[PDB]
Design a protein around this ligand. Sequence first.
Ligand SMILES: N[C@@H](Cn1cc([N+](=O)[O-])c(=O)[nH]c1=O)C(=O)O
Ligand SMILES: N[C@@H](Cn1cc([N+](=O)[O-])c(=O)[nH]c1=O)C(=O)O
Ligand SMILES: [Zn+2]
Ligand SMILES: [Zn+2]
Ligand SMILES: [Zn+2]
Ligand SMILES: [Zn+2]
Lengths: 258, 258
Amino acid sequence: KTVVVTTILESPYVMMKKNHEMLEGNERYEGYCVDLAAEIAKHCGFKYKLTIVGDGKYGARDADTKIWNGMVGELVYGKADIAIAPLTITLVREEVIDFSKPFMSLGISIMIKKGTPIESAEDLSKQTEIAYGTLDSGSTKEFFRRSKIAVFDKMWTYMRSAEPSVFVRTTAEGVARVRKSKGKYAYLLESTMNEYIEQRKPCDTMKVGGNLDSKGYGIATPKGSSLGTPVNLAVLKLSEQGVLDKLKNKWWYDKGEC
Amino acid sequence: KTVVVTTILESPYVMMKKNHEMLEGNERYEGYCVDLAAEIAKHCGFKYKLTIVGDGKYGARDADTKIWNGMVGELVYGKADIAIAPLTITLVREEVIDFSKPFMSLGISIMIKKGTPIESAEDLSKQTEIAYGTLDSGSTKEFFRRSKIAVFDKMWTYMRSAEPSVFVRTTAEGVARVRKSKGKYAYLLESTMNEYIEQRKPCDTMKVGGNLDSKGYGIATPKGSSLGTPVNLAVLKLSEQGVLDKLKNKWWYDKGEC
Ligand SMILES: N[C@@H](Cn1cc([N+](=O)[O-])c(=O)[nH]c1=O)C(=O)O
Ligand SMILES: N[C@@H](Cn1cc([N+](=O)[O-])c(=O)[nH]c1=O)C(=O)O
Ligand SMILES: [Zn+2]
Ligand SMILES: [Zn+2]
Ligand SMILES: [Zn+2]
Ligand SMILES: [Zn+2]
């Protein structure tokens, strides 16, 4: 049985290769998670096909219907056997799917156009000249929605009602919005992405302040899947072998252009 | 049934209260892990008894007898129901006990007496004037014994054969050795401990360089135990509701003496 892997186009985790049009199957893709997938499959001994999540979302549960979308939904409804992606380990997800131990740590962070007069989340919350938002479906939005911290709740109150909307469908759209907004939009996004983007041309963005939280990405499987245990053990093995660090260095800093 | 919790006297995770001789049961202890245990218990809905691990050890498998010592052994042999302590999530332990998702991130780091001419593991590995060692049992030592990375193996090769022994029995012993050795002993230890000590009088130590690796502490339960699921969910809930961050700040920095 070939294992169906659900993933998402998000640099430098999974990207189309320069010459992908002349390539087929898994070979079209490169990135940290593409490499992680190959290692996991090697150590657990399976063959697999990478497939990009149809709706291009990470996964949230619809309030009215209670149906899960995104990569999470593909696992929940049996469309994929495993998700190998920058997928945040969260409580609401852990209730419907299984996560391995984390293969990467991260936090929510702030991205600004260079020269923007912002140093912190508190700075953002105390002003109005500069708009700010998050990836409009995923763990970061849910963080602000659920936050009982005054600074973040204040920010959520602003974001939920902002007009026009401050939420974006993809990271690419968020970043483009910072780049074109002349310093009038700051983007809240995961630190790993922020750090990658800061080192790529045109080198006009930067991460400011510390992370707003601490969490991790894990490999996800359907609850009670037989893949859950071997995969978890494979992640810890790769961590202890230094492989996760090697991949991180390969995809972030060896790819710096600034 | 009252849940038996195994833990270890290691500041500031668990410490004897000043008037402990006058107190009983759980009230004898204080620290990050005592606070965490209270929250875990409250969220899972169980009564518990804190007990200090008899042999004062974290957990290793004796190569000869194959017997597990430390907190891991107390779980494997059924002497405790759960371990709430700075216990590192590792592959070999995951094979015999269950771990929650990590409640704290960390890495192996270098502690020096202020003014020691050392900035990194490479620096340490390329010289012999300054001695260096690790806790004589635990995941840090195992990290070096197992590492296939040139620098860390070079360090291990030095450390296993160094005489007198560069290894120490307790964190306290390592720190005292740093402080007394006039810059001629550096101590390799987990970053969280390093960070704690840097804010303690006499304020004569510091963490230098990046971390050598990345990993996490997890709450541990016997394989197959029914506490595993609720406990994991409780960890994620505490992470997301900011409790883990509050606790780290309370015990590391709010008490800061430097
Ligand atoms: N990892 C998240 C998805 N996700 C991704 C990014 N991102 O890649 O910058 C983000 O800023 N916010 C977010 O919730 C999840 O799993 O929902
Ligand atoms: N957390 C470890 C134990 N452990 C603790 C410390 N520490 O408290 O400084 C250390 O420096 N090295 C180590 O292996 C494990 O679980 O074995
Ligand atoms: Zn194309
Ligand atoms: Zn491998
Ligand atoms: Zn005493
Ligand atoms: Zn609570």
